[PDB]
Design a protein around this ligand. Structure first.
Ligand SMILES: [Mg+2]
Ligand SMILES: [Mg+2]
Ligand SMILES: [Mg+2]
Ligand SMILES: [Mg+2]
Ligand SMILES: [Mg+2]
Ligand SMILES: [Mg+2]
Ligand SMILES: [Mg+2]
Ligand SMILES: [Mg+2]
Ligand SMILES: [Mg+2]
Ligand SMILES: [Mg+2]
Ligand SMILES: [Mg+2]
Ligand SMILES: [Mg+2]
Ligand SMILES: [Mg+2]
Ligand SMILES: [Mg+2]
Ligand SMILES: [Mg+2]
Lengths: 155, 106, 92, 127, 197, 61
RNA sequence: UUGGCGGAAAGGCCUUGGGUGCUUGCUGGCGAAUUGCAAUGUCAUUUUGCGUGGGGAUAAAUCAUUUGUAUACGACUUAGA
RNA sequence: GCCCUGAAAAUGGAUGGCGCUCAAGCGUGUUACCUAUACUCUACCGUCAGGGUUGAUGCCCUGACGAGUAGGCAGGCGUGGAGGUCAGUGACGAAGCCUAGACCGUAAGGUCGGGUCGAACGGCCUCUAGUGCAGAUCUUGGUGGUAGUAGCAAAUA
RNA sequence: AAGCUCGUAUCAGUUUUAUGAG
RNA sequence: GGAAUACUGCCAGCUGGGACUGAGGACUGCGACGUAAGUCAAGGAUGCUGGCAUAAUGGUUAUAUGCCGCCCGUCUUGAAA
RNA sequence: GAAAUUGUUGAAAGGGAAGGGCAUUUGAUCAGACA
């Protein structure tokens, strides 16, 4: 015997957790996040690009589109904390986004993405064409210049 | 365009300290364009990155990052306090850091 | 800076040269292969027995100036223990 | 595959070294209390070494636990090994330093059959 | 926000300029100081000369070559005033000091660069009118600096060249302003005025 | 800091446990500890207290 | 590629003539996606390394010997195809 | 009230230094700001106290405390030898020694890997003592710097 | 440190009231 | 004569931003919204998602940087002195 | 076949001592956990 056996042994019956009193409640977005708003992307592959916010998804994400014909950003999800909501707004009542959801964006090109992109971008472009220089504004990328102060800049 | 910058520039001033002892767990950061605590309140909670270069490649890059965040203001002149996951080396007193715009309240 | 030439940087230039020299020396050692490989490499010894005597014995079986030598006594003991392990492997 | 435990916290990971054990070869690093009446270390002046005390004591629910979450139990043979046949999730067996390779083979085989984790399964068994 | 800040030292008070520059160097800003011979010290010339002569008294008795070194040039006087405010025996202090260059006059290439001022160190903004002050070039010449005339001649030549450059620049600016002022009635100009530009 | 009015970490005392190694005496102490806790009987309290005394404090009768 | 200027540490400033691109001054058409909801997500001169190659030029210093205007020893000052 | 004189020696030096003149000086007022092992909240260690309880000097719940020389009390770590036990370890390698490797203890220490080594040694319950070193101008033995240094120049060669 | 008792028990580097001293 | 405002104070008024913490581990209790079954922020954190799956986090070791740190024992009020 | 002390090799530091504490960078090196 290289070591004496202990007199007492802890039990291996793992106890269950106590009943947690933490209910899940819907997210309250910022007052500036209204569908149809132009958003600046702050991070990711499409950082510094201006897109259009379309729909709030069940996973606390925002459905956005470029539109893909204007600046090459497809129908994607974004996190609301990584965007800047500007003041520019376009109408979205002509856009049908009742199909897209988390199950749609699950990843376990399919060309159903392409078809839905064409259908959504048609109405988005129709709404965009009414405002002058809005298409050029959405195609241009955002960046900070010398001496820009984000705590003073309006959006 | 000619610029792609999505961050504000800052300088790592020093550690939190008294006259004869310092606390490396807290760093003092001076953000460009900020001169008052009222203006510094905008940047609370923003991510800070210290980006530096090393000669040996690690995971496909020669560029290494130390992450942290803004926690509170400091003084009357727009200096803030920041905490990083690993404390800054203290050879970086006077070096540049990047204050990002996320998480965003705008 | 030096009191004889205050406009010329001295300490920063010395540190920059030192950093550059250390980087070049490390790169030269890596290219010479004097550094341990990655942990997931096939030739990594991570989590395994590290023994100069066993490494020398197996290098001699496979077939500059070094301080790593294998004694005849240890080599004979290695051969004997390898015969024991081979007999066990044959039995199972 | 151990018992669930809180995150292990060590209050003082660094070793408590004896004063001037760096200064003199004849002074070993094993901790000794300074009994001098004028000792700056004993009087606890700023800038000196820290001394062991009960405040540094570890959490009783994480005490004696290895990083894998087990308690180490030294074993010399199969009979010592089979003491842990029911306390598998809390204890891991460690073979004693003086067990021969021929017996370590048997111990490892029996431990694998019984599902008992072995702390040092590579000892003396290089191929 | 400039990578290098060039400060015209004329009309500044030495102590306050030294304080602000030392803080900038510690924060990690590269600074060049020009025209150090035109710096000012508050107080009378005899007082400042007396203070420098006390400094001259200070020396190591058993070997003068080990003692305090008394550099006579105005740039070196300013450098002493700043080294007294930088913790210069540490690596951090040495690194801060190595972000600083001080010159008498404006040598190249800084003669063709923009030069700024520090309002909190300016004499006309700080000192009460009527208080006496001292010029660093005269003080340095009285304590042994021997290059005041050479610097004056070179500065005069530089001023002539800079005046010619400014005359050409002012003519071009007048031409540009004339060409811009005639387009203030266009619809583009009206839209820019509506947007504030 | 605090200005303590009384001593700190003061033991109550009162002869908690017997100093003997008699296993039968320890069994009797166990039984009367149980009785004194679960009966609220002053007799059981007195007997339990007397079982802790030393030889010079338990004179014969 | 034409010419002028700049010596404070000039090493930069201005200018002539074609060439070759770009131009968001204005109007259009195609492309972007999957980096999967963020992870610096790598973007800037110089390279005493090599390979290709057209050209350019073919030295000294020290030891040893030697002098004494030099010298404790080094050092110094001379001479030798 | 502030300012100047209102006495001073002897290496070169001090509002701590730089320096500061509508001050960065003096008197006062109003705010903001910096930070102690102090105060407040939380976690963890230990001690003490109060309750509960048919490995019970254990377990569970709650609360408050923690400076220390001489001195007191308590719990522990380590060593030689002895009785008992593990039908303990060991020539497939005991003890010892070395170790840029691993782990557990607040600590005294304990455990594992590798190398060297070549015959004995350990865990636990107890017994016993010539049982723990940094010092004593300590004892014995061994070894440095000084240092290739001082010097090996009386007695004619 | 040990016993015995008692435990709205025993009190207190404090105040108050009455009464002295200055 | 009619108001407003400043100052001081109160609300068991509403609401935005930031930081540290998540101890406990079946149920029991006190409450709230509810006719109702039930629900809840009420006797201590859960839910959703991404990347990596190894030297990446982490440890050790050699050093660098910022700040702190006088040589121990003994004996003397007291010792750098 | 220990230490003091020494040689060689490799790595590192060094502008009038070195050593220690807290924290992190860099170089080197390494264990666990891998269903
Ligand atoms: Mg002179
Ligand atoms: Mg306390
Ligand atoms: Mg002051
Ligand atoms: Mg005042
Ligand atoms: Mg052995
Ligand atoms: Mg003895
Ligand atoms: Mg000794
Ligand atoms: Mg002693
Ligand atoms: Mg001695
Ligand atoms: Mg000699
Ligand atoms: Mg003779
Ligand atoms: Mg690390
Ligand atoms: Mg100190
Ligand atoms: Mg021998
Ligand atoms: Mg040795």
């Amino acid at each position: 015997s290289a070591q004496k056996a202990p007199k007492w042994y802890p039990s291996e019956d793992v106890a269950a957790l106590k009943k947690t009193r933490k209910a899940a409640r819907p997210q309250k977005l910022r007052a500036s996040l209204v569908p149809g708003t132009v958003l600046i992307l702050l991070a990711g592959r499409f950082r510094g690009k201006r897109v259009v916010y379309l729909k709030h998804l069940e996973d606390n994400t925002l459905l956005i589109s470029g539109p893909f014909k204007v600046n090459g950003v497809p129908l994607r999800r974004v996190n609301a904390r990584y965007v800047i909501a500007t003041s520019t707004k376009v109408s979205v009542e002509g856009v049908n986004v009742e199909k897209f959801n988390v199950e749609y964006f699950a990843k376990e090109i399919k060309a159903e993405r392409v078809e839905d992109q064409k259908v959504v971008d048609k109405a988005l472009i129709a709404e965009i064409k009414k405002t002058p220089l809005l298409k050029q504004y959405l195609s241009a990328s955002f960046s900070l210049k010398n001496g820009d102060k984000p705590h003073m800049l309006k959006f | 365009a000619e610029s792609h910058r999505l961050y504000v520039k800052g300088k790592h001033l020093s550690y939190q300290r008294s006259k004869r002892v310092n606390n490396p767990n807290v760093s003092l950061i001076k953000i460009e364009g900020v001169a008052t605590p009222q203006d510094a309140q905008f940047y609370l909670g923003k991510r800070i990155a210290y980006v530096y270069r090393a000669s040996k490649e690690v995971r496909g890059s020669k560029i290494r990052v130390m992450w942290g965040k803004v926690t509170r203001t400091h003084g009357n002149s727009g200096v803030v306090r920041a905490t990083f996951r690993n404390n800054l080396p203290a050879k970086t007193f006077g070096a540049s850091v990047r204050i990002f715009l996320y998480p965003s309240n705008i | 800076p030096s009191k004889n030439s205050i406009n010329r940087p001295k300490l920063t230039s010395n540190l920059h040269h030192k950093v550059h020299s250390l980087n070049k020396k490390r790169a030269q050692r890596e290219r010479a292969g004097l550094l341990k490989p990655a942990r997931s490499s096939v030739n990594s010894k991570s989590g395994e027995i590290k023994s100069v005597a066993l490494d020398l014995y197996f290098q001699n079986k496979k077939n500059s100036i070094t301080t790593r030598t294998l004694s005849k006594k240890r080599a004979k003991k290695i051969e004997r223990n390898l015969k024991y392990a081979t007999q066990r492997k044959l039995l199972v | 595959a151990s018992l669930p435990h809180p995150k292990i916290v060590k209050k003082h990971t660094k070793k408590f070294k004896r004063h001037h054990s760096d200064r003199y070869h004849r002074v070993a690093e094993n901790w000794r209390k300074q009994k001098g009446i004028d000792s700056v270390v004993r009087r606890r002046f700023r800038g000196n070494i820290s001394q062991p005390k009960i405040g540094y004591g570890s959490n009783k629910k994480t005490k004696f636990l290895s990083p894998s979450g087990h308690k180490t139990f030294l074993v010399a043979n199969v009979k010592d090994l089979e003491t842990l046949t029911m306390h598998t999730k809390t204890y891991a067996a460690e073979i004693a330093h003086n067990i021969s390779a021929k017996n370590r083979v048997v111990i490892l085989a029996r431990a694998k059959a019984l599902g008992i984790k072995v702390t040092n399964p590579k000892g003396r068994l290089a191929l | 926000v400039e990578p290098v800040v060039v400060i015209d030292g004329k009309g500044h008070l030495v102590g306050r300029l030294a304080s602000v520059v030392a803080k900038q160097l510690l924060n990690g800003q590269k600074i060049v100081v020009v025209r150090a011979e035109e710096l000012n010290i508050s107080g009378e010339f005899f007082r400042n000369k007396l203070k420098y002569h006390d400094f001259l008294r200070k020396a190591t008795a058993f070997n003068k070559t080990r003692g305090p070194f008394h550099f006579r040039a105005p740039s070196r006087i300013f450098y002493k005033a700043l080294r007294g405010m930088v913790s210069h025996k540490t690596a951090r202090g040495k690194a801060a000091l190595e972000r600083l260059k001080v010159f008498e006059g404006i040598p190249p290439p800084y003669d063709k660069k923009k030069r700024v001022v520090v309002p909190q160190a300016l004499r006309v903004l700080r000192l009460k009118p009527g208080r006496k002050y001292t010029t660093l070039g005269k003080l340095s010449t009285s304590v042994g600096w021997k290059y005041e005339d050479v610097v004056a001649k070179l500065e005069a030549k530089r001023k002539v060249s800079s005046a010619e450059y400014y005359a050409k620049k002012r003519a071009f600016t007048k031409k540009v302003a004339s060409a811009n002022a005639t387009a203030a009635e266009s619809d583009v100009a009206k839209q820019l005025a509506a947007l504030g530009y | 800091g605090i200005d303590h009015t009384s001593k700190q970490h003061k033991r109550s005392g009162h002869r908690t446990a017997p100093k003997s190694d008699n296993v039968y005496l320890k069994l009797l102490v166990k039984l009367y500890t149980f009785l004194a806790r679960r009966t609220d009987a002053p007799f059981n309290k007195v007997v339990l207290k007397a079982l802790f005394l030393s030889k010079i404090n338990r004179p014969p009768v």
